[PDB]
Amino acid sequence: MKHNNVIPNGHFKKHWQNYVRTWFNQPARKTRRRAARQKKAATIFPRPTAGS
Amino acid sequence: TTRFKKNRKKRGHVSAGHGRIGKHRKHPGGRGNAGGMHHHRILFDKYHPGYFGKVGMRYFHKLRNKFYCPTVNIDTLWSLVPQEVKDKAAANKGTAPLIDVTQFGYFKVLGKGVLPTGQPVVVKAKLISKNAEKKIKENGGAVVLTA
Amino acid sequence: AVPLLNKKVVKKRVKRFIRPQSDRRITVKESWRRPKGIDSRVRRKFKGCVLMPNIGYGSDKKTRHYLPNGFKKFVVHNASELEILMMHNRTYCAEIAHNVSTRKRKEIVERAAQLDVVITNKLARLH
Amino acid sequence: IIWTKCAYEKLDAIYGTFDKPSQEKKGYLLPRPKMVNADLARIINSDEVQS
Amino acid sequence: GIDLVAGGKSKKTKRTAPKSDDVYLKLLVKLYRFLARRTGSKFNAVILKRLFMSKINKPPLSLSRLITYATGKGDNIVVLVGTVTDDVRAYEVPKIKVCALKFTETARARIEKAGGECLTFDQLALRAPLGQNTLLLRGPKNSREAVKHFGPAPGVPHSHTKPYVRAKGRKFERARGKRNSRGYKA
Amino acid sequence: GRMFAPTQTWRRWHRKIPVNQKRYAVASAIAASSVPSLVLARGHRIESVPELPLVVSDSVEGIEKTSNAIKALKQIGAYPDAEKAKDSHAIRPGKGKMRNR
Amino acid sequence: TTVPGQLVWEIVKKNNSFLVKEFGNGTAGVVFSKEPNNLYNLHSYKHSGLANKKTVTIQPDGKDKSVLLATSKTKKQNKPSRLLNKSVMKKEFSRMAKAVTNQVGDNYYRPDLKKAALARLSAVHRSLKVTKSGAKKRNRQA
Amino acid sequence: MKYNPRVSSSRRKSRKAHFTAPSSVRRVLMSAPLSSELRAKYNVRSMPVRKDDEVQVVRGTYKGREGKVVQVYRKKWVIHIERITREKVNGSTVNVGINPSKVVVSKLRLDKDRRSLLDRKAKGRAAADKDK
Amino acid sequence: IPTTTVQSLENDSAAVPLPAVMKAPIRPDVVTYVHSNISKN
RNA sequence: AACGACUCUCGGCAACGGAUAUCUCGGCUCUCGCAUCGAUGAAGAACGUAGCGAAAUGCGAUACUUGGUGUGAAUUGCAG
RNA sequence: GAUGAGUAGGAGGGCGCGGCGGUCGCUGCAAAACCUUGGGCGCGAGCCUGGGCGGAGCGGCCGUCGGUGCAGAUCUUGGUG
RNA sequence: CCCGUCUUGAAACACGGACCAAGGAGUCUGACAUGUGUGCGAGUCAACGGGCGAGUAAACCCGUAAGGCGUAAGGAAGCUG
RNA sequence: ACUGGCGAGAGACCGAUAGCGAACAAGUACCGCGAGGGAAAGAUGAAAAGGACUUUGAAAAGAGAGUCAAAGAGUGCUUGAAAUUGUCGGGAGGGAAGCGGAUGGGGGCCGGCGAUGCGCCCCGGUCGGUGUGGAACGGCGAGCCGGUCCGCCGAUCG
Ligand SMILES: [K+]
Ligand SMILES: [K+]
Ligand SMILES: [K+]
Ligand SMILES: [K+]
Ligand SMILES: [K+]
Ligand SMILES: [K+]
Ligand SMILES: [K+]
Ligand SMILES: [K+]
Ligand SMILES: [K+]
Ligand SMILES: [K+]
Ligand SMILES: [K+]
Ligand SMILES: [K+]
Ligand SMILES: [K+]
Ligand SMILES: [K+]
Ligand SMILES: [K+]
Ligand SMILES: [K+]
Ligand SMILES: [K+]
Ligand SMILES: [K+]
Ligand SMILES: [K+]
Ligand SMILES: [K+]
Ligand SMILES: [Mg+2]
Ligand SMILES: [Mg+2]
Ligand SMILES: [Mg+2]
Ligand SMILES: [Mg+2]
Ligand SMILES: [Mg+2]
Ligand SMILES: [Mg+2]
Ligand SMILES: [Mg+2]
Ligand SMILES: [Mg+2]
Ligand SMILES: [Mg+2]
Ligand SMILES: [Mg+2]
Ligand SMILES: [Mg+2]
Ligand SMILES: [Mg+2]
Ligand SMILES: [Mg+2]
Ligand SMILES: [Mg+2]
Ligand SMILES: [Mg+2]
Ligand SMILES: [Mg+2]
Ligand SMILES: [Mg+2]
Ligand SMILES: [Mg+2]
Ligand SMILES: [Mg+2]
Ligand SMILES: [Mg+2]
Ligand SMILES: [Mg+2]
Ligand SMILES: [Mg+2]
Ligand SMILES: [Mg+2]
Ligand SMILES: [Mg+2]
Ligand SMILES: [Mg+2]
Ligand SMILES: [Mg+2]
Ligand SMILES: [Mg+2]
Ligand SMILES: [Mg+2]
Ligand SMILES: [Mg+2]
Ligand SMILES: [Mg+2]
Ligand SMILES: [Mg+2]
Ligand SMILES: [Mg+2]
Ligand SMILES: [Mg+2]
Ligand SMILES: [Mg+2]
Ligand SMILES: [Mg+2]
Ligand SMILES: [Mg+2]
Ligand SMILES: [Mg+2]
Ligand SMILES: [Mg+2]
Ligand SMILES: [Mg+2]
Ligand SMILES: [Mg+2]
C-alpha cells in the first residue's frame, strides 16, 4: 500500500472465480422470452396479450 | 491494449523495471490494509485522518426512504416553469404562477440566489427555509404548504 | 537515365555491428542486441572490444538510402506500379519483387524500357 | 451508397437538421463543426486578413 | 568537457501542437499559425497556444458569467477558447457577439433568441484578424473535483484538502485524527 | 503444463460507446458517402456514376429476380463497382481459411 | 470534392486506396500516390488529385500516340461521369505544349502545376515514341 | 447463403460427414451427369452410377475413353471401367479408378426401379422449373 | 436550395432537396474510435 | 619444417536429427433443444462369438448378427 | 546557434510475429519454409534482392487486437557431442 | 581476461552455464486515482428490460415521477440550510 | 439454474512439445501389494502405378533396369533447419582459440562495374501546317475569354 489512494475494499478473498455469472446468453434469453410471449398470445387468442 | 503496455518496451532489460536491488517480491509490506497502525502509520495519518475509531450513534435497520428530502434553491425555481408559461407570467402582472415543486420531485425550497426581477411567484412545497420564504415574500409572492 | 544525385556517398562505417560473443555460441545470433549486463565490458566501452551502434554513425541525409548506382530503390510488383516512377526516373530505380513470375517480369522490363526507368534486377529468372 | 427515392427523402425526418430535431431520434440534433468554413484559402487570402 | 546542465538543453515540456486528431481543430491551428506568424499580434499568439491545450485546460464558461463580463461591452466581441454552456440562473440575456469552439444546444438557442450571434474562430479571423475590439475570456480552470484533492495532505495542520473516501458518513474518516475526543484533530 | 495467465471467459469482450457518439459516427459516414473524392479514396469505382448522392427511382424496390437487379446496376452505372467485388473473390490467407472464414 | 479541398486532405492524407507506402515509417519510408489526376504521383496537398477541385490529368489515350489532356470541371464536382473535360491531342509536341500551357496557366486554372504538366506531357510523349519504335539510346551520358 | 438452422456451414463437419458417410449415402454422392443425348430424352441432369452403365471419361489422362462400368468401389470413391487399365511393373493389368463426377453416362442400365427413379427426377423439373 | 437528381430506370418530380445530414461534419477520428469499439460486440 | 599424419578452420557433397512451412474425420470455448437408467435385473465386470482376427468397434450359443420396414445393386485385404 | 558519459529508473520514436475490419497485389511461366563464399539498404531492431531447394499458398498498406520477440532460470521436452 | 548474476568491490580460488532446436515469465478481472482523446453538458448515462432486426449473439429504437453519479452543505443526532 | 447425458449450431480460440491426459486398437501400453500413477505415437502418391527382369552375394543388400510429373516422393516415405559426423577441396598451426581496429596477399563476386550522346548544317523519306465552316466541351461569371477534333482555302514552313 502506497501513495494517496482510497482505502481498497475489494471482496475477492473467497473462491469468487467459481461463482462468476456471465451474460453471454443475454441475447438468447431475449429470444426465448419473445418466443414464449408469441406462443402465449396465440394460445389465449383473442384475449389481450397484456394479460389481466 | 497489449501493444501499448510498457512491459513490451522493457523486453530484454532483465528486471522489467522493478530494479536489481529491491526486486519485485510477493508482498513485502503485507497484504491490503495490513499494518495500518504499525508500519503504514504515517500513510494513514497523513492521507486518511479519522480512519481508526468510532463516532456517533448506531441506527439499526435504517431505511433511507424516511429521510428522502430533495431540495431546490430559489435561483433554480424559475427554470422549472415551462417557457410558454414564462411568457404568460410577463404578460399579466395581476396574477402570479403557482410553482408546485413537488410535481417536479422536490420537497424543500432553499434560499440560494435571487428570483427574477418584478415577478411574483406562489411557491407550493412541503418545507421551506426562512430565507427562501423571505425572498419569495419580498418579491411579491406567497408560500403554500402541502404534503 | 542520368541520376540526379551529385554529392559523393560517404559511409561512416561499412562493417556491420555484430552481437557480442555470437562467434562463441551458435545459439547467439549475429543480429545486434544491446548488452545489458552489469559487468559487460562491451556495454562499458573498454578499448579493444566490440563496438556498439550509436546515432553518431548516421549517414548524410542527402545521400541516405542511395544505391551505388546513384538511385533510390522502389519495389514494383506489376506494370501499373512501375508507372508511378515515370516522373521520378532520375531519382528512383525499380526493383521487381522477388516473387513475381518470369512471365510478368518480361512485361515489367519491357515497360520500364519505354519509360526509361532503371531496373536493378532485370536479368532475374529469365534463363 | 445507392439511395432509393423513399429512403433519401426520409433522411431529414430520421436525422433531423441543424435547426429542428429528429422525429425518430428523440431530442437529437446534428453536430456542429468547430470551423464553419473549412476552406483555408478563402480565409487566409481574404481581403480582411491580407490587409 | 563543458560545465553545463544537460548539455545546455531545455528540460521543459510545452505543447507545440494539439494532441487531438480533430480535422477541424487542425485546420484552425493552421489558420492561426499563419495569423500569428504574419501579423505578430499578441492576440493571435495567445489564441494559437490555447488551441493546443487539453480539455481540462479549456474549461467551459457559463452563459451567466459571460453576461457579467460582457456588461458595458456590447460593441466588443467575446472570445473563448472553449465551450459556452447555458445557465438557468441567468434570466435576461442581452444581444452579444460570442466566438467559441463550441456552444451547447441550449446556450446557442438563448444567444440567438436575444439577437446575438454565435461565431467560430474562422469567422472571427474575417471580423477581427488582429483581435481588434475583442474580450478574451477563460473559464474557471481550478473549479473541479480533482483540484480539491490537491495541495497539502488532508492530515497536516492548516489543510482543507479533501481526502479520498469511498463514502460519506460518521463511519468514514470521522474518528481519531479528526476530533480532539479521539486522540487529536489534525 | 499450464499456460501463463490462462485466458478466461469473463474477459471484458464488449464495449458500450455512448449513443450520441454512435449517432455522430453514423452521420459523419453518411456525409462522407456524398463526397466523390472520399468514395474514390476508399477504393470504389464510381467513374461512370452519373452523380453523388446516387438516388434512384423507387421502382427498383419491386425487383424480384437477380438478373433484373444486375440490369438495374448497369443502368445507374453502379455495375463496375459490383464487378470489382466479384473479380476480387479469393481464399483468405493464413489460418483464417480453416476457421470457417 | 463537394466539401473544401483542405478538409479532404486532412482525411485522405493518412490513408486512401491510392496511397503507396514502402519501407515502413522510419527514415527508409517512401510514399507515392497513384491517382490518375496526380501529375507527379506525389502524396502532397499540392499534387493531390483527391483534395483539389482543379486538377490536371495527362496520360496516353488509346492508340496512335494520342495524349489525353483532361481537367476537372469546377461546377461538376458531384458528377463523376462528367467531371473530366477531356481533350485528345494527336499533333506535334510543340502544339501539345502550347495547349497544356493554355489550359493550365493562361486561364489561371492551376498555374502552380504548369511546370509539372509540361514535364508530365514531355514524359508521356517520349514514352509513346519509344513504344512505337523501341529503345535506341540508353540515355546514360552526362 | 443458407438459412436452415439444421444445416451447418462448418468445414470440419462437412468433411467428416462426407468421409464417414455410409454405403447408401455414398451412392448418391457418387453421381455422374447424363450425356446431352440422355438429358434431352429423360429430362434428367444427374444419376447415381450403376455397375452395368456405360460411361465416357471426359477428364483426366483417359479423357475420351468409353466403356462399361464393371465395379462401383464405394469404399474408395471410384468406379472401374472395362478396358480402362494400366500395366504394373510385373506386366499385370489393373483397373484404374475414376471419380464418377469426371465421366458422362452414355447408356443407362434400365430396370423397374431405375425407370421409376427417372420419372421422379423429371417430374420435379417439369413442374418446379418449367411451370413456374 | 440544393437538390439531388433522381436517376430513372428503363420502363419507369425528378429532384429532391439535399438532406441536412449530408452536410454533417466529417470526423474520421470519431468514426474510427466508434467503429473499432462496436465491432467487438 | 617440404610431403604426409594430427588438430583447427572455410566451402561442396553425403550423413545424423525432426525444427520450420503448409495441412487436420481432433481439442477448446459460447449458444440452443430435449428429459429418457434399475429387481420387467441397471451402470460396471467376465467369458465367448467371423471362412481366414489379436486389438478397437459390434454382438450373445439365433453371438461383427435374426426379423420388419426403407433404400434399390453391392461387400471388398483374400477366398468362396 | 548551442550541444552529446550513464547503472537502477522513466519516456519518446521505430523494428519484428500471429489474427480481425478494410484496401492494394503476388502465385504451377512456381507461393510458404528452408539453403547460399551472390549483391545492396538502414546508426540499429531489420529490410530488399540474385541463385538453389521446394510444390501450394502468400504478401504490402491503413486501422485494430494479442497466449507477440530469449543465451541464461542446477529452466521444460526432444536431439547431439 | 567469460558471459549472466548478487555485490562497496568479479577475469576471480563467488554461484548458473557441455552443445542445438522448440517451449519459456507484469497477464486477465473488480474498485479507485491522476493524465490524455472523444461525446454531450446542469446535466449525463439504452446499463435490467422491452420493441425489433443483418431470416438476425451485431446494428437500430425506447427512461413514461426508474435508477446511478452530479446539481448543497454542516451536525453524533434532533435539526437547520 | 445447468463444466453430466443425448441432439444441434457457432467462434477475431489451438494447430501434433499446441489444443482435453488422449487427432492414432488412450484412460490404452506400462508401473505400483494397494489406494492410485499414466505416456509416446498424425502427413508416400492424383492413382500402388509399392520397383518385373539381368547380374554379384550364404543372406541383408548392391549395381543396372523399370513405374511416376517427381523417386532429389521407395511402406515412420511431403517439406527436411541446428547441434553433431564422414569425405573431397582451400588454408593455418613453437604450452589455447576466438574477438576489435588497420592494411596487405590469395580467392570469390559485381557490366546501373563505366559513357559513347548532344548541338548546328543538306540529301532523301515520312508526318503535320492563316482565314473561314462544322462536332463535342471548357475558364470566368446574360456576356466575354478559350482549347481539342474533322473539313475547306490560303500560306508555304515546321
Ligand atoms: K449465464
Ligand atoms: K517501474
Ligand atoms: K581440411
Ligand atoms: K565439410
Ligand atoms: K508445423
Ligand atoms: K442381466
Ligand atoms: K470382443
Ligand atoms: K435390419
Ligand atoms: K491483406
Ligand atoms: K538471400
Ligand atoms: K496488424
Ligand atoms: K547472484
Ligand atoms: K556471493
Ligand atoms: K561459474
Ligand atoms: K493516487
Ligand atoms: K437522472
Ligand atoms: K424505457
Ligand atoms: K455536534
Ligand atoms: K500429452
Ligand atoms: K518430394
Ligand atoms: Mg483464497
Ligand atoms: Mg536500463
Ligand atoms: Mg532480478
Ligand atoms: Mg520493495
Ligand atoms: Mg502486488
Ligand atoms: Mg552498413
Ligand atoms: Mg559494476
Ligand atoms: Mg527466390
Ligand atoms: Mg563536447
Ligand atoms: Mg545527462
Ligand atoms: Mg475513549
Ligand atoms: Mg496540530
Ligand atoms: Mg504463415
Ligand atoms: Mg464391427
Ligand atoms: Mg547520453
Ligand atoms: Mg505477418
Ligand atoms: Mg556458411
Ligand atoms: Mg513485413
Ligand atoms: Mg492466439
Ligand atoms: Mg508468452
Ligand atoms: Mg535457447
Ligand atoms: Mg538474460
Ligand atoms: Mg541446463
Ligand atoms: Mg535433457
Ligand atoms: Mg554422450
Ligand atoms: Mg562480500
Ligand atoms: Mg561478472
Ligand atoms: Mg582468488
Ligand atoms: Mg547463491
Ligand atoms: Mg556448473
Ligand atoms: Mg523460441
Ligand atoms: Mg478522464
Ligand atoms: Mg428519479
Ligand atoms: Mg441546530
Ligand atoms: Mg445441458
Ligand atoms: Mg498432446
Ligand atoms: Mg507449431
Ligand atoms: Mg502435396
Ligand atoms: Mg522427407
Ligand atoms: Mg550442420
PDB file of C-alpha atoms (C1' of nucleotides) in Angstrom, chain K residues 46-75:
ATOM      1  C1'   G K  46      15.531  -5.169 -39.514  1.00  0.00           C
ATOM      2  C1'   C K  47      14.590  -4.708 -44.792  1.00  0.00           C
ATOM      3  C1'   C K  48      15.126  -5.519 -50.293  1.00  0.00           C
ATOM      4  C1'   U K  49      17.027  -8.575 -53.993  1.00  0.00           C
ATOM      5  C1'   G K  50      20.219 -12.870 -57.191  1.00  0.00           C
ATOM      6  C1'   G K  51      20.824 -18.197 -57.245  1.00  0.00           C
ATOM      7  C1'   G K  52      19.277 -23.010 -55.213  1.00  0.00           C
ATOM      8  C1'   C K  53      15.708 -26.312 -52.983  1.00  0.00           C
ATOM      9  C1'   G K  54      10.593 -26.972 -52.584  1.00  0.00           C
ATOM     10  C1'   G K  55       5.405 -27.950 -54.955  1.00  0.00           C
ATOM     11  C1'   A K  56       0.649 -24.638 -52.888  1.00  0.00           C
ATOM     12  C1'   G K  57      -0.169 -20.977 -50.999  1.00  0.00           C
ATOM     13  C1'   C K  58       1.482 -15.721 -49.670  1.00  0.00           C
ATOM     14  C1'   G K  59       2.440 -10.541 -49.104  1.00  0.00           C
ATOM     15  C1'   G K  60       2.276  -4.702 -48.924  1.00  0.00           C
ATOM     16  C1'   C K  61      -0.526  -0.532 -46.801  1.00  0.00           C
ATOM     17  C1'   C K  62      -4.374   1.906 -43.014  1.00  0.00           C
ATOM     18  C1'   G K  63      -6.932   0.782 -38.554  1.00  0.00           C
ATOM     19  C1'   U K  64      -7.472  -2.545 -34.593  1.00  0.00           C
ATOM     20  C1'   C K  65      -6.417  -6.729 -31.426  1.00  0.00           C
ATOM     21  C1'   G K  66      -2.933 -10.462 -28.731  1.00  0.00           C
ATOM     22  C1'   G K  67      -1.166 -16.884 -25.331  1.00  0.00           C
ATOM     23  C1'   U K  68       3.580 -11.168 -29.810  1.00  0.00           C
ATOM     24  C1'   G K  69      10.347 -11.088 -29.737  1.00  0.00           C
ATOM     25  C1'   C K  70      15.182 -15.401 -25.105  1.00  0.00           C
ATOM     26  C1'   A K  71      21.698 -17.187 -24.085  1.00  0.00           C
ATOM     27  C1'   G K  72      20.998 -17.981 -19.112  1.00  0.00           C
ATOM     28  C1'   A K  73      16.143 -19.665 -14.619  1.00  0.00           C
ATOM     29  C1'   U K  74      21.176 -26.816 -11.018  1.00  0.00           C
ATOM     30  C1'   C K  75      14.694 -23.707 -16.697  1.00  0.00           C
TER      31        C K  75
END
